[model samples]
Target: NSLALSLTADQMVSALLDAEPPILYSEYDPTRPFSEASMMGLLTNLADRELVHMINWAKRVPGFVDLTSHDQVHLLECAWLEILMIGLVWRSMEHPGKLLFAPNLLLDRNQGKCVEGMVEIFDMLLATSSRFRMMNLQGEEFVCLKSIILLNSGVYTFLSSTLKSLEEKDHIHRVLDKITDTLIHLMAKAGLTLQQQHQRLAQLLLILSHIRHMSNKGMEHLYSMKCKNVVPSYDLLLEMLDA
Candidate 1:
């Protein structure tokens, strides 16, 4: 038998698509072999494309570094979840109406290229902002700062609440307190001159926390307990800012 060779990215993607049945389809054919060569080639091609997209994405959203390390990590975690959600979305698109299932939806499930893209874009903006700190217009920094604020607030509400309420009944008060503590600590680090700005940040965070808490309460009752809800609604969270 001759070994399969990858000639182009399109061919690689096609081969990969043909190589393995999706998880939903695999239950019927457990003995089928997947094409590693095609998968690897597709991954390589994807990495190249992701690198270019990451650079452009980072350039488009400047000032990702002004956030605290904790906030940065939280944003990364959210981005990773979004990447997985995007995967589910793509898989859904591929098969149309069929639902595709995958293991490791929680914990240890790497977001593949999307996580790398998030990191690359974040790092680029951070580095770029550092270089232009004094030279760039204040408005540019403000715009990026807005995103940082929104992301930080949203994560504080969602991640902390989800983790804290995992085993026990959901307690809004306890979750709100956790949100308050996180904001207080963050504000304390903002220094004296920017105290007012820090207060505003805290207020914004509090508002987001309350809004997210309400949304979660609504969702818990609306969706079935067995249903998966791992993705953050970044767009809705952004809208919470407008409200």
Candidate 2:
């Protein structure tokens, strides 16, 4: 808690974003257009790598591993999309209305024909990207938002009755609540008054709800791609995409 209290918002943001797992693909060669198969392969690889990193990252969070293994899996299933979105937003911050899948690969709304519903999904993502840019949402706020999304037990639907009982005792909620408080403190440090802080918090929750909807839509889009055989089925990627 002392470390959280002492660190500047910028410092925390750097640490969180820097810890993101690196994508393995090379610089996109624009001269050689990517075939549909190649694009699918790249996306599958990226999702697989990111999923592994996300699991490890969750384990590192205080009290995350202390939950029942079932609950842990449930949390990961419920939260992966939001976490992915946060990273996407961080990378896209440099380029408005564009998604940076990797450092060299920039995706526009019209690109990528392999996925049937990609245009719609991309449009949603672009809007989210624009909102982030317009709000001047900083890294500190993003990291805190990611934490809040990850600890969302109330929204998880697949937990069994037994697991639900266990979920209530999980310490992740308390830890995330503390982080939320720290975020408010950081906001105050940035010169916002109490009223402004409250407003900002409300705005963040609104944005988060939008993110949740986007995640649901994205999963459906991916499922369409899967059904069309546009992408080679990677088991882990499929699981995480739906998870």
Candidate 3:
């Protein structure tokens, strides 16, 4: 079951990347310190924004609507952390060794030490950011890689029969194949050598593996926060992580 994309790869990429509204730094109180509560609030806001953008982006993917609603939620739940990391890395590429949380909030490795395991996360981020800069990964390529991540069915160890079956997985794969084709076409257009293209593709896949590890590390960090009673509420965030 092959389905045609409503937009070309470039158009889709642009739309997905630009789907979220920019944070208005001016509206926030700049004098306020980054306390644990403030950090939790920021995390909540960031997660909320990503959820909205992801739902909109998923709607644009061909055959995505055909999946059961439960499966759709499941996919988004599993993939949100990866997508969040992609956006984080994309923005961090501009500023080396720092993470841009919002328009006005930039945190260096030391600044993020408030949370447990944050130092290690910062190290991972810095290394990943450096690799992305070295590769000079294009926005369109990032979007294509993101789409591949979103469509991946291997992340789940077990899904309910009604939510995900062989047919559902095959449908998602068909969509992924189309996106991969578009990605290859874009690579050629970018004038990458055959070897460069192969290497780039492999690196992008490798990045996904790195993100998965990062997500796991982050989940542990979040759980630790919960145990310390630092987070205000984990109901929604926990659902997103555990779903």
Candidate 4:
């Protein structure tokens, strides 16, 4: 699914999106099930596919591998969901007003009375998708901002503001600075004025708050499901899902 990015800003964006798992609705719901358990079953299966790609892609993002293992793992734990949210929103851009969860999980924003509280999660994603459309997000810009979220976002606080040291945070800020420059380049290339470019940059970053908000609401839905014993093992998913 992907691209070769020789530090090539535009090229890297393609790499990120190309690496994403495909979701084809061949039959849309060739064989469908709406029950909460079935939906989780379906999504959980695709979640594994995403995990595979996520790990592979992050390793190459600028400066991702330079962090200490502990620092790197911490960042991953905190930001994976946010990265996933942005990825989902960016992908949904191509599919009109729907959420593209996976090769088999393409669903409408207006889904039915199924999956218990899961529809709200979908709605959460759908709402962000519209804002993305409004801001006219491009793949290149999204890929860069996705990097920003990864290096900066965190567990409960939404950022590494208090937990991380100045050195580490400064290191991350350097990386983000370059990546952000690349994003601004994207805007500049699109013929935006400097004022407009700065405005859009702020818009992109502020819109990122949706990730934390979405995480809180959607994460609880999953947690409650687990407490209810709806799904099987959370052995691996526990760390990410629990916090």
Question: Highest TM-score among the candidates is held by which one?
Answer: 3
- Expressed as tens digits, the lDDT of each residue in 1-243 for candidate 4 is 012213566655555566554432322453465666666666666555565566666667767666655566677767766776777788787777688775456779555246677677787788888888887777677777777777787423334555445556666676677677778888898999999999999988888887778967766777876743422233443343333
Regions of model 2 farther than 4 Å from truth: 1-31, 153-155, 158-170, 227-243
Q: List clash counts for every candidate, in order.
A: 0, 0, 0, 3
Give candidate 1 regions above 4 Å deviation. 1-34, 58-74, 84-243
The TM-scores, one per candidate, come to 0.23, 0.78, 0.81, 0.78
- Output the better candidate (1/3) by TM-score: 3
Tens-digit lDDT track for model 1 on 108-140? 112222322223322322333333333221322
Cα displacement (angstroms), candidate 1, residue 92, comes to 5.6
Candidate scoring better on TM-score of 3 and 4 = 3
So what's the TM-score on candidate 1? 0.23
Tell me how far the alpha carbon of residue 17 in candidate 1 is from the true structure, in angstroms, after superposition. 29
Model 4 misplaced stretches (Cα beyond 4 Å): 1-31, 110-112, 155-165, 227-243
lDDT of 1: 0.33
Candidate 2 lDDT, tens digit per residue, 129-186?
Answer: 7888887888778767776787773334544466656554445555566666767877
Q: Each candidate: what lDDT? A: 0.33, 0.66, 0.69, 0.67
Q: Pairing residues by index, what is the TM-score of model 4?
A: 0.78
Error of 3 at 204 (Å): 0.8
